[PDB]
């Protein structure tokens, strides 16, 4: 029996648009009047930061706060602007300002209420991504939010995904994950794949389902219980 639903990482409440708005806002109220295109800093950013991410997957869990900051002070110093003080309180500005939700996502929260625990996990310090859900109206429409911060391990490390179990109180086989992380697999949850754009085929194979559309999900998790 299906029990618990979890949403894994912003990557699936936030819409791809968004996503690069609120980094590109970031990017141009950092630069200021300094003669650097938004979009090269922005570009050079996601490079840097993609690689501090893989350096830690894995690893005992550490701020992205810290890691941003450290990536920051590179591109200061290769472009030649002044390093922005701070950061992080600009970063949340312009989340709350521009992030946004996929259209169906209030609904497909509500859709499950009371029926199946409803937990997102997230590779996220604690702090800012729950006011970040509370500025996108949404944190009360869960159950549990785990992040590596709480388990103290960052993805893949499993101690995420026993936390979030734990919250639910239920075993693996009782959960369904929805994410584009294409796989956690030892504990028996259900996996998901979100593939917006049809993008990932190489890695449905990998996948107990391939959705589209998060209201795909409840229709899974009722043929899963009959």
């Known amino acids: 029996m299906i029990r618990a639903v979890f949403f894994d990482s912003w990557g699936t409440l936030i819409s791809v648009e968004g996503a690069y708005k609120v980094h590109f806002k970031?990017?141009?109220?950092?630069?200021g009047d300094y003669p650097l295109n938004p979009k090269t800093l922005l570009d050079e950013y996601e490079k840097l930061a993609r690689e501090a991410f893989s350096n830690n997957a894995g690893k005992?869990?550490?701020?992205l706060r810290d890691i941003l900051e450290e990536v920051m002070r590179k591109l200061a110093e290769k472009y030649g602007?002044?390093?922005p003080e701070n950061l992080w309180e600009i970063s949340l500005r312009m989340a709350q300002r521009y992030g946004e939700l996929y259209p169906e996502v209030v609904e497909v929260l509500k859709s499950l209420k009371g029926k199946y625990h409803v937990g997102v996990i997230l590779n996220r310090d604690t702090e800012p991504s729950t006011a970040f859900l509370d500025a996108l109206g949404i944190k009360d429409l869960f159950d549990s939010i785990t992040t590596s911060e709480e388990a103290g391990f960052s993805?893949?490390?499993?101690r995420i995904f026993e936390l979030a179990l734990?919250?639910?109180g239920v075993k693996g086989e009782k959960a369904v994950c929805v994410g584009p992380n294409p796989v956690s697999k030892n504990l028996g949850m259900t996996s998901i794949l979100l593939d917006r754009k049809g993008e990932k085929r190489e890695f449905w194979d990998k996948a107990d389902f391939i959705v589209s559309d998060l209201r795909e999900v409840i229709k899974i998790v009722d043929e899963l219980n009959g």
């Open 81 to 83: 602007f002044k390093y």
């Open 60 to 63: 005992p869990y550490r701020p």
């Open 166 to 168: 734990k919250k639910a």
């Open 26 to 31: 970031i990017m141009e109220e950092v630069l």
């Open 155 to 158: 993805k893949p490390h499993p």
